[PDB]
Structure 1
Amino acid sequence: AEYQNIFSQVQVRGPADLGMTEDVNLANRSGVGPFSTLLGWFGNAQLGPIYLGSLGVLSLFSGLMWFFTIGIWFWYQAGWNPAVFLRDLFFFSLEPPAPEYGLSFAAPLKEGGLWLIASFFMFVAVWSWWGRTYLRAQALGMGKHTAWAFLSAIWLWMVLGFIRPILMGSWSEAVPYGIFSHLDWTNNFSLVHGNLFYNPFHGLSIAFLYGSALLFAMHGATILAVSRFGGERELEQIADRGTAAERAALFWRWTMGFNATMEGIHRWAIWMAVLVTLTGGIGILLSGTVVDNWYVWGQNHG
């Protein structure tokens, strides 16, 4: 009975891979870390070298600064007691400023403020990391696909906490920092806009999210099925089509009547997924700014 190829039967190690040079400044790349044997049954074993220039350091500082700003506040709520802090961890919440202050930075710390501080720290963390996603690609002379796809995730986020809070004239429309609290905000949002199941963008967003799981289930299983012909070597299979690429295309033509190429399936993949947060971000942006109730809008489309 055949091997399925989810975990390797035999690992193999050699000299730590320091990567391609191209145009990267090697003055920043770290030393190769250890080799996780656990990791190596599934993917690569090498916890090898992370590049870390100036934009990377900016991110990590402010990312931790945001992470700490929220956390020290959770203690202020927990009475500085570790026992409570651990009991009520999901319940704590750093909530936005009250609607009184509108779109100003004049709020007290115990009434907002601390929330703005954290958000600034998060804002700068994400954008610098994005630029880092672009730059890492240019140094290697690769296309900017990863930076475009990341932009679409930024879109949804950028709408939820910035673009849409601005258009309502209030920071209260923003998401609080909390495990159970940000959940409540979400369920709350649907209710106040007359059920988001009626937002035609919401339900398109769902189609793409469902489709992302369906596609990657499809693709992943297909590459595993034709790995016996070295299907995973997708880049070379693009420049020189092997039988792996052929019986992969042919499985699907024979099943559902049409098919992809080895390159084309990845265009399907990046789009299917990228449209989850694109559609979804438009659906939120319209909620409360142009449409007050998605039930009402739905009745008389307009």
Structure 2
Amino acid sequence: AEYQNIFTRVQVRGPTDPGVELPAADWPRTKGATHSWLLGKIGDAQVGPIYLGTTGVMSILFGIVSIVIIGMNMLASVDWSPLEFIRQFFWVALEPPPPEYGLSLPPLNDGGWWLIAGFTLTLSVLLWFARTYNRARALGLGTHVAWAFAAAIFLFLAIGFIWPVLMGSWAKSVPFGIFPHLDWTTAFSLRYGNLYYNPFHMLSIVFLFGSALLFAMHGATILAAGRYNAEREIEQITDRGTAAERSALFWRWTMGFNATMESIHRWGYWFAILCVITGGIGILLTGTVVENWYLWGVHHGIAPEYPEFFTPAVDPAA
């Protein structure tokens, strides 16, 4: 019977926080900020205010146009039926151009809407990167969050823009839909011979699994050391308390080595961005310098060989 530090029991509500004052060139923040009891159980209860700047507003405008174009094409695909839109919600999409158009501009209803939606969505994420970059600089912080986001954009641009351009056709890019973009993910692996054999896909999984592993470790460690005020990590970095000592000692005694309170966030930071960086690189390599990842794996001696269990099929057209 002990407090498990899962939900906050006792809460205190002060005045709503306007935030750290910005330089006298940024737009005023919004004036709407409230407190939610439900969100205070997990963490900070205050919702709002939000900053709306030049890049923030422009990113929303590009993002809305992208979402409207995708949504209207989805709704038109089911003959404007809201009932069929709900029924087919996971299946509808905005389809990329067919392969015949290459990298040229296709007609609106033959991949043109996809290219416009992709362009405006790319602009919105690029402007959102600048928005995240400027907010960190305005408060005098480092731009680590912005560059972590830029790593995510790299995979977003590699999958949807850079790799299709290298392949010479917009058709290879991914449709704007839920199940259709899962179909693209599977068809990508089928087309290029089991993307499991892509080494950068393996590495991207290493850091994806390692990110969940690291946050499970770090999240549990901080919650386990929450008795000693471990969640106050800034103070524990500039002034090492016993929580940082116990957290470091917990993992040292467990697996022989440990990080610091600051350095575990570097580990988590790099694991998250390496997942997305290696993923983007692996997508760029396939189709461009590797045709069949399994045959590439056989060429490098990594494909296992299985003993006979059945009578092998022989290609009748071979």
TM bucket (normalised to shorter chain) is over 0.9
Please give the secondary structure, in 1, of the residue aligned with 2:50: coil
How big is the shift at 1:200? Answer: 0.6
| 1:49-93 CA distance string (max 9 Å, x none) | 111111100011111111110111112111112221211111212
Deviations 1:201-257 (A, max 9, x none): 101111111111111000011111111111111111111111111111111111111
Q: Is the 8 A contact 1:149 1:274 kept in 2?
A: yes
Deviating beyond 6 angstroms after TM superposition, the runs of 4 or more aligned structure 1 residues are none
The match for 2:48 is 48
**One-letter amino acid of the counterpart of residue 254, structure 2:** T
Q: 1:253 maps to what in 2?
A: 252
Instruction: Find out whether 1:151 has 2:150 as its counterpart.
Output: yes
Conserved 8 A contact 2:226-2:243:
yes
Q: Which residue identity is paired with 1:188?
A: A
Aligned equivalents of 1:251, 1:245: Cα separation in 2: 10
CA 1:112–1:207: 2 relative to 1, 3 Å: same
- Report how far residue 25 of structure 1 moved: 4.1
**How far 1:27 sits from its partner (Å)?**
3.9
Q: Contact 1:34–1:46 at 8 Å: present in 2 too?
A: yes
Equivalent position of 1:243 in the other structure: 242
Specify the code of the residue in structure 1 equivalent to 2:89.
L
SS in 1 for 2:47: coil
Who is 1:104 aligned against?
104
> Structure 2 unaligned runs (5+)?
302-318
In structure 1, what is the equivalent of residue 178 of structure 2?
Answer: 179
Query: What is the distance in 2 between the residues matched to 1:103 and 1:294?
Result: 25
Letter in 2 for 1:275: L
**What letter is aligned with 1:91?**
W
Indicate the residue corresponding to 1:192 in structure 2. 191
SS at match of 1:166: helix
Letter in 1 for 2:164: P
* 1:137–1:299 CA distance, 2 compared to 1 (3 A): same
Q: Distance in 2 between matches of 1:178 and 1:93?
A: 4
CA contact (8 A) 1:96 1:171 kept: yes
Distance 1:298 1:27 in 2: 54
How far does the alpha carbon of each residue in 1:246-298 deviate from its partner, in whole angstroms, 9 at most, with x for none? 11111111111111111111111101111101111111000101100011112
Q: 1:30 to 1:22 in 2, by over 3 A?
A: closer
Between the two proteins, the alignment pairs up a number of residues equal to: 301
How far apart, in 2, do the equivalents of 1:293 and 1:88 lie?
34
Which aligned pairs between 1:19-168 and structure 2 lie closer than 5 A? Answer: 19-23=19-23, 25=25, 27-105=27-105, 107-168=106-167
Q: Give, in whole Å, the separation in 2 of the partners of 1:22 and 1:228.
A: 34
Contact in 2 for aligned 1:212/1:272 (Cα 8 Å): yes
Q: TM-score, normalised by structure 2?
A: 0.92
Normalization by structure 1: what TM-score? 0.97
Q: Partner of 1:233 in structure 2?
A: 232
Equivalent residues of 2:18, 2:49 under 8 A apart = yes
Q: CA deviation at 1:26?
A: 5.8
Structure 2: how far apart are the matches of 1:22 and 1:54? 15
8 Å CA contact 1:33, 1:48 repeated in 2: yes
State the alpha-carbon separation in 1 of the partners of residues 281 and 42 from structure 2: 37
Q: Is the 8 A contact 1:8 1:42 kept in 2?
A: yes
The residue correspondences of 1:281-296 to structure 2 (distance < 5 A) are 281-296=280-295
CA distance in 1, matches of 2:244, 2:86: 52
Partner letter of residue 30 of structure 1?
A: T
User: Aligned to 2:92, what secondary structure does the other structure show?
Assistant: coil
User: In the alignment, what sits opposite 2:16?
Assistant: 16
| Residue 125 (structure 1) shift | 0.4
Match of 2:309 in 1: none
SS of residue matched to 2:94: coil
Shift of 1:108: 1.6
Which residue does 1:204 correspond to in 2? 203
AA aligned opposite 2:230: G
**Structure 1, unaligned stretches of length 5 or more?**
none
Q: Which amino acid aligns with 2:157?
A: M
